[PDB]
Design a protein around this ligand. Structure first.
Ligand code: HEC
Length: 104
C-alpha cells in the first residue's frame, strides 16, 4: 500500500474521530497508536463498547481490511458510526499508513 495516499485517506475519512500519534488524544474514537497485534477494544484509557471489547480478534492487515469495509457488519454493536471504504486498494493504502503511523 501507498502510505502517502493512505495518510490523505485517513485525514479525509478518519481524523475527525481519531488520532494516530503516540500518546495522541482520544476524540470521538480512540487514539490508535499500538493498534497492530493488539486484540480489539483495548486502546488504553478509552471506554469501548462491549462489542468492540468482545470481538476477540487481533488487529492486522487482513482483519482491518474486513472491518474497514463495513464496520458494523464486522463488529455489530460498535459505536463507530462510519459507513466503510468500498475500494480494496484504498483500504490497503489506508492500512499501510496505519501500520506506519501507529508504530512510529
Ligand atoms: C467517528 C464518527 C468515527 C470515524 C469517522 C471513524 N471512527 Fe473508528 N471508531 C469510532 C469509535 C466511536 C470507535 C469505538 C467504537 C466502540 O464500539 O467502542 C472506533 C473504533 C475504531 C477501531 C477499533 C480500535 C480498537 O479496537 O482498538 C479502529 C481500528 C478504527 N476505529 C479505525 C478507523 C479508521 C481507520 C477510520 C477511517 C476510515 C475510522 N475508524 C473512522 C469512531 C469513528
Amino acid at each position: 500500500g501507498d502510505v502517502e495516499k493512505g495518510k490523505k485517506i485517513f485525514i479525509m475519512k478518519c481524523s475527525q474521530c481519531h488520532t494516530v500519534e503516540k500518546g495522541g488524544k482520544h476524540k470521538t474514537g480512540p487514539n490508535l497508536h499500538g493498534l497492530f497485534g493488539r486484540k480489539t477494544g483495548q486502546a488504553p484509557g478509552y471506554s469501548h463498547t462491549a462489542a468492540n471489547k468482545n470481538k476477540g480478534i487481533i488487529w492486522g492487515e487482513d482483519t482491518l481490511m474486513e472491518y474497514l469495509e463495513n464496520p458494523k457488519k464486522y463488529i455489530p454493536g460498535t459505536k463507530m458510526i462510519f459507513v466503510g471504504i468500498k475500494k480494496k486498494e484504498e483500504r490497503a493504502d489506508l492500512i499501510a499508513y496505519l501500520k506506519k503511523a501507529t508504530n512510529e
